[PDB]
Amino acid sequence: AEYPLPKFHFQVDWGGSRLGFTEVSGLDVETEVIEYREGNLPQYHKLKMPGMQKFSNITMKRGTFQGDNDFYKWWNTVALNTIERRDLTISLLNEKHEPVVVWKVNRAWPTKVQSTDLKGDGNEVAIESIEVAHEGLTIQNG
Amino acid sequence: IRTYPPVSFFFEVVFQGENLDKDVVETRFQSVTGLSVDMQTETLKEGGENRFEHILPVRTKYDPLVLKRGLVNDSQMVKWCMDAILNFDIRPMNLLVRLLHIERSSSTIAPLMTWKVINAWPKKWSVSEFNAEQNSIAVESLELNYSYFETLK
């Protein structure tokens, strides 16, 4: 067609009871650059070549409901250097409620859990957040 | 009576030699150092005197003189040095080192301090590293031996 897609209809599968979230970020892939030059090159700028890869962490937010303490449980699964690891899948849906773009995350485990702030005059809900480390990510469109 | 001290970055070097005193490129240097003298002594202990020992003068030592420039591809001075180094043929020279200032009474450039350096001859010659990945200038450095230096009072 000739029309783009929006970002207000998605889904996350993380091994919990609720698939709804308010914010999803940190989807990025990067590669390093190596520079090189020899003495007699008629070119005075350096040459470039691919190096190692690097992935960023994942940050997700959600509102707080009564009777739901999954973030703390997963974080507290930690032992000296061991922890439960999970496969994380994030999808993008259309108007028939089917997927369109999929991000696949291998061997995720949480590194930070942040609770809410309390203000007396605050007319806002209670927001908790988590940060996730993971080895590698993939992108599937179509 | 002095209130402000002199500045170090306005200076000159003169070769009182074969015919090098009239060559303009032979007076322009990026750096000059090595102008220092030291007295070497020995220690003698006297029995019965436990409060101090005697320090006795022995000899005098001088530092080598070091000059640094950007590389000059055709230099009479370097011909003199390489004649000394390759053919073991040395001919010592005299030098002047000047520290300059502005005098006015309009203004003029004049010497402020002058040292005479007696019987200099080549000691060392070097050029900096060539590196394909750095922004740098080819810099040559010369080191000289001499007998002594004096103030032109």
From TrEMBL, chain A:
It comes from the Bacteria. This is All3324 protein.
From TrEMBL, chain B:
This is All3323 protein. The lineage of its organism: Bacteria, Bacillati, Cyanobacteriota, Cyanophyceae, Nostocales. It comes from Nostoc sp. (strain PCC 7120 / SAG 25.82 / UTEX 2576).
